[PDB]
Amino acid sequence: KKGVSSTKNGRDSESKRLGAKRADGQFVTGGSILYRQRGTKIYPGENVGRGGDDTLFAKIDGVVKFERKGRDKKQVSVYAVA
Amino acid sequence: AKLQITLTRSVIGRPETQRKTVEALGLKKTNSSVVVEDNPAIRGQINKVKHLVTVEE
């Protein structure tokens, strides 16, 4: 009946709000984040710096562009605003 | 190419994407009817509401 007697598993509010935070064809400012992740689900290219949680940003203004490298693993690479 | 439209079956009970896409064309109360020049854009904007609208030309 009621109560008897169990777990209570369930630790259900556990959130961090990852993902992507910009898109291709998007002007962007220095210091701005593009894409949170972990490990290297995306690598950086040019005009980029990474951080102590595998975040990504742009050291300099420009225009975001993702790319392919080796049939598995991508990379992101700002290129110069004209 | 002009194109006479006519709304026939209303928007009530229908979701909002359809609804907004109707009012985009300047379609107020039922049986209202505008005339517009044709495009890929406009006809694709009809195709979302193809059932509840007519096209004369």
Binding site: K1, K2, G3, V4, T7, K8 | -
Partner: protein, 141 residues
């Protein structure tokens, strides 16, 4: 009731599957085989009973297979309870059957005795059935 066919769990609780549709899964081993056709899924107990039948009525040995195995449990919890609390204990195992699987197959016999044993099976399962010959797949590469 009885659950002979079993395995290492890997986990004892699982969200169910409930069937929608498919075809396919032709015969590959024997000659004659049973095709499930319709609305249900299965427990192991049933399959065992069907095997008892299909082994008796065929003397002369006569070969049988079961192309499927229940990889899935079937939970059902204490008697006369209020709902709510944690998912219940184990009672059963399951082998889902969309319309198009081929449960039972045989060879070594003629066309008849097969057909009888298969009647005597399909009375002992939920699903409506159909009798089939191995003449063709829908692909051979």
């Amino acid at each position: 009731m009885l659950l002979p066919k079993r395995v290492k769990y890997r986990r004892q609780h699982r969200p169910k599957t409930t069937g929608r549709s498919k075809g396919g899964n032709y015969v590959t081993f024997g000659e004659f085989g049973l095709q499930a056709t319709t609305t249900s899924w299965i427990t192991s107990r049933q399959i065992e009973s069907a095997r008892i039948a299909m082994t008796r009525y065929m003397k002369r040995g006569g070969k049988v297979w079961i192309k499927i195995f229940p990889h899935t449990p079937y939970t059902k919890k204490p008697l006369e309870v209020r709902m709510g609390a944690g998912k219940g204990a184990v009672e059963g195992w399951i082998a889902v059957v969309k319309p198009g699987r081929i449960l039972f197959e045989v060879a070594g016999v003629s066309e008849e005795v097969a057909r009888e044993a298969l009647r005597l099976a399909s009375h002992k399962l939920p699903v409506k059935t159909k009798f089939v010959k191995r003449e063709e797949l829908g692909g051979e590469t």
